[PDB]
Design a protein around this ligand. Structure first.
Ligand SMILES: [Zn+2]
Ligand SMILES: [Zn+2]
Ligand SMILES: [Zn+2]
Ligand SMILES: [Zn+2]
Ligand SMILES: [Zn+2]
Ligand SMILES: [Zn+2]
Ligand SMILES: [Zn+2]
Ligand SMILES: [Zn+2]
Lengths: 408, 408, 408, 408
């Protein structure tokens, strides 16, 4: 299939007019296609080159998070009207031949944070090499797995209404605690905005009101749903004429929650897709957020070891039906378990961000506690991590660990 | 294997000395077994007979929720010491031959509430019949599925310290909003307490400080994890000598979250299990909450239709990394979708509480929005519910709906 | 549901009028049901009590194979006419509460033979205990698995024409080598025939022309398809009015090919089923043999170690597209591999007949060799049997083995 | 990873010195690698360009089957000695970017034949297009599936002894019926032999004794095991120093048996692989034929409709434990079923050769009949093919069919 958007990794994303990093109804289509068209799009990694394949974490700590995410699009679809559904088949996804590695990290609390930032406040990095379908890290010994390759971010352009709501409610929330490190949301920011085929005046009004791509919203966008993977079929709400489908933020793999924030195994690559329409889909099927069907080709792991958490935090304080706090406990429990086998806490945390662990909302009614589970697939280890009568052999030798960078 | 605790459904649970409905370190063992023992335990449904197989919801409206849950146990295991892990193999689980039906319901907001109680505030009920491995409801046409049969509630007796913490933090939370309908937690309550073989003054003492079985806690207890099912192996923390393992609240099936609160498909039944020990297991493996391995025998549904939600509520107000609010959105999206096929909202809500739907914590870092997904297995419908170019057809037409009871 | 055919294991099968052990159009219905009826049938093990739970193989050696199989039925279905399809839902299947064990064996070559009878010519036995969904044998250490519970034999009564063809072609084949040990087929035999409710001369006429139940045929019958298991839906061709569905020969588990001949794990038990009709199904769907849909509840083993064979026998002699010889080599390769871990050959051969191993007709065109594969699920062993750089380790300490009985 | 053997589809395979089409101990290594090396090999389709993407079957009719299969290799592995096992990870496999289509056909009975050549004696062809992970044919409407991408042929060079045995037993078998159309085996043939880098005199001899690659043998070779797919790990017996691993005959998909003979969906492509050794692997693990582990990434089809056959042929003749005849019956039964939905017999036959259907050796003991099953995954049709009460609707219209060529 022909590649309709090409990416040169050594060219600055700002120099590519078919790339953009904010959501706005007025970004012009990077290309137009007919319904039924099938084609490939190439993509920068989300940072657009900021993070390197080496053994230092300073890049993770110093990255300018206002730049993310560099998306390829918007793709225009002829005849697409507001209120349609845009049916997207993800026919395949992969890494570029010249870039067979990816990265996971923990941001510093001072520059982004993450799910377990109170336990791992310093920036770190693991590097992942791709071996066909499989991946592994020089930083995490004894671990090998097939990737669940997915776009972290995909979705259609918002209408004027939608964008106004997003900015209002999100700036409103920053207003309630504007000095929290890390912040509660990210406001529009024109300084580092890439607005596609835009320069001058229209570029500068739109860049000042253009939404950050950081959070998932009603249209889809940055959902980081690992299961929205190569082979899947997704149904997107359409808000503007021609839809304006963009995609980026490709992951070779990811755990549920993407707890590390900085991936997932983040990568540059390509997406091969087919597009079509359901006329008036949104009203016909009562669509608000996207809906999709998962892939018939995914890694078949099923020998899970499953960890539990409840809505009582690390300090012993009682919350109310809080799935977020319950998941944190399940993740911490899994980390504690892994450490008994010789993994550092950073190796374990990176693992939960990268390997295809499951996070279930098992119970959300048994007041006051929600119950959340974290499913660790045991197939990914080249030794048996199941409990036995005699106790764990502390297998993991070496002195290998994830790079760590002191704060600035 | 022999049944070590027998249950007569027509006998009041209070008259059975091997049953109890509060957690307390001093409830004496209902029976003693050797490590390696295999045996069966019979169980009351969680209410102990309050809910009937008929077409009215008044029993659900009027049930005395202080009575739940009637558990079978505690089972003493010889040589079990605090800090051990109790290894339980769930070898099989089923319904009683004389009781081949179960119930799902929504509590009234005035008497219990639930996940979608703002949308369905009146008490309702669906009745499920068991056909070998399979189930269906006269109240929900076109739906048939294999059950994922599991105990909703299982775990070991707390020590004195643990119980004190539970009461302290939970009464503390009630104190912050004591008149809230429904309540934030349930305090100890001696009026409806069944304390097993406890007699005299010690009984009345213990009943006044005995914790409700309603929430999951560090020991396990009422987790309502559907995947802790027949065929699973679970590892419980031991707090007192002999462990004191109790089990109840059997489910023929359940969806992730148990959003309906009143099940799941609640039933009476039996559990066939084997028990063993890992000496000093808790410290060896860094165990706080239980861990387990899921069953090799589960329903193989994989053709999911997957719905999404973010941390923005039904009023449009913006929350911060709130998985609970995101899941509500995903569930409501699923319900809206099913309605287009002719299901009532009540049918849809009941379905999500009963069928083995998956609830994933897909993303919990993309500030401000968490992303939660609800996975509806399409194999359970006897017609195709997948989106087509044509839009849906109302294949659900006709009479039956769930019983509904007006508020007292 | 109600049990329409009851079985007393201590009663001779000949004394039960609702049992039979030959196929004949004139055996009267054991019971009549309406289409849509759901009910249970109890069953003798195929031999009807000949094999015992002990540590000697003499019963296997001496069994009278003319007696097999004692089937429960024929069940009549009101309105069923020749050329219909009888739709049978297998809703559940299990062992009797008073008989929680089963048996596998190798027949002596002198009395039955088997797939590897040139390698294991003496009669042997392994006994299997049922632990809820799971099984294991005191004769084969280190192995545990969830059973794939299925009827080895199920199908409808032949019409007069069909029965005549069966006898003609099968006696014709015996004629080509009548003194062969073991025989090529089994002729009608009135001596040990149980003809249900048939009386007098009519009974006598039928027992002399009644087909042995030993081989699978166009109607179904003794297929020993492990995947025709609890949870399946099967569609049977109907030849006579009322259909006359019979069932027996229940297996707790079996490997593809049932290579040991004497099971499988043979057992007495029960089948819970629902029946219905497709009017004129046979012509509508071009049905000759039965067709079916496998169960949504089966053991999820996927970590196979897969062995190969080609159409060259143990003497090195070249055959032509012979899948039978190819599968023998694949089984023999699997046995040789297992022996390196400390299993006897008999243990391994019993294992392949009992555990849910897969046998695939991988290639049947690459003249002169067919390619057959044997898939051994590695999850059934409590130690890792995968190849490593170091080679195997004799982990099966020994002492215990299958009973063996010298020839008479 | 780097491509160590490159292929120009427009260059004659005879002009590529790193390709060969006969098995012989003396073909020199096309390249040498160290143990632990990972690399790519590109491949011709098995015919090397003979079959074209068009709507006529004459190329299939006229192809010179003495030329097949053009393999890439032999790959030398430093330190590999006879009696070792060569561990091969298949890390990924795909189609070439310039060649995103493949072909299935039936050979004429006069030039190759096939499993159902008595029913389809004239040469035919279906063409398949690749859409990322998925495939479909302009010749078979209503069918879409994810490919189970595998090498049909892979293995190591035989030693002198092995080669002598192969020729002796195979020429011996041709001797028993030398004029048979099609032949029972294919003898060595120097006319169309490509012997890699072998030269002049030494080569003219090797080409006269070099075995055809057509059948699977002890070393592996052309097994056409669909499940030996991308993601798999295979363990090959080593016969000569450096091993000499070759590979070709790549399939995008195939059904069990490869009944159509001419594929499978045959294609040109590439294989990304890693190699390593088990020193003395063959004796350590009692290896005769290869063994392998299937892939964690395969198409997840589960909703099978399963067809049966027994050892009684199309003429009604009775065979003895003949799996080959039983499989033919099961395949013919499946074809008859599909025709009721509007497919031609040719469409159905091509489908069974290409789609990932399963063929099980379900029973091989119930004298006189073997029982074989054919498993059609129903997910591959864009309409429901399951039996219902009112019968099949003839969905397949149009007038498209496979090209057919009259005999030469
Ligand atoms: Zn993302
Ligand atoms: Zn990302
Ligand atoms: Zn519960
Ligand atoms: Zn419950
Ligand atoms: Zn049988
Ligand atoms: Zn049997
Ligand atoms: Zn081949
Ligand atoms: Zn091929």
């Amino acid at each position: 299939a022909e590649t309709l958007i090409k990416v040169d990794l050594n060219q600055s994303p700002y120099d590519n007019p078919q790339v953009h990093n904010r959501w706005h109804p007025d970004i012009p289509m990077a290309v137009w296609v007919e319904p039924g068209a099938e084609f490939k799009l190439e993509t920068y990694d989300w940072t657009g080159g900021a993070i390197k394949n080496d053994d230092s974490a300073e890049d993770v700590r110093d990255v300018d998070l206002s730049t993310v995410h560099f998306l390829s699009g918007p793709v225009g679809v002829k005849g697409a009207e507001p209120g349609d559904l845009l049916v997207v088949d993800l026919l395949d996804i992969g890494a570029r031949d010249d870039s067979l590695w990816g990265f996971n990290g923990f941001f510093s609390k001072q520059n982004g944070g993450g799910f377990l930032d109170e336990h791992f406040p310093l920036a770190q990095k693991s590097i992942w090499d791709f071996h066909g379908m499989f991946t592994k890290s020089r930083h995490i010994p004894g671990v090998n797995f097939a990737g669940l390759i997915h776009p972290g971010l995909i979705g259609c352009l918002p209408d004027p209404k939608m964008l106004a709501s997003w900015n209002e409610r999100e700036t409103g929330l920053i207003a309630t605690d504007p000095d929290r490190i890390p912040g509660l949301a990210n406001p529009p920011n024109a300084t580092t905005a890439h607005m596609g085929q835009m320069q001058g005046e229209a570029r500068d009004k739109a860049a000042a009101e253009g939404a950050r791509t950081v959070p998932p919203r009603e249209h889809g966008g940055n959902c980081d749903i690992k299961d929205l993977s190569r082979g899947s079929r997704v149904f997107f709400p359409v808000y503007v004429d021609g839809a304006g489908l963009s995609v980026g933020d490709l992951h070779f793999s990811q755990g549920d929650g993407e707890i590390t924030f900085c991936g997932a195994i983040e990568m540059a690559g390509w997406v091969h897709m087919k597009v079509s329409l359901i006329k008036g889909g949104m009203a016909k099927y009562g669509i608000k957020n996207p809906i999709f069907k998962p892939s018939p080709m995914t890694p078949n792991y099923k020998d899970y070891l499953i960890f539990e958490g409840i809505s009582v935090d690390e300090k012993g304080k009682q919350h109310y039906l809080d799935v977020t706090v319950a998941y944190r406990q399940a993740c911490l429990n899994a980390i504690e378990y892994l450490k008994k086998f010789g993994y550092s806490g950073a190796q374990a945390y990176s693992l939960l961000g990268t390997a295809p662990v499951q996070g279930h909302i098992s119970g959300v009614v048994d007041v006051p506690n929600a119950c959340a589970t974290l499913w660790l697939p045991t197939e990914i280890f080249d030794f048996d991590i199941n409990p036995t009568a005699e106790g764990p052999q502390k297998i993991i030798t070496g002195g290998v660990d994830l790079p760590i960078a002191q704060d600035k």
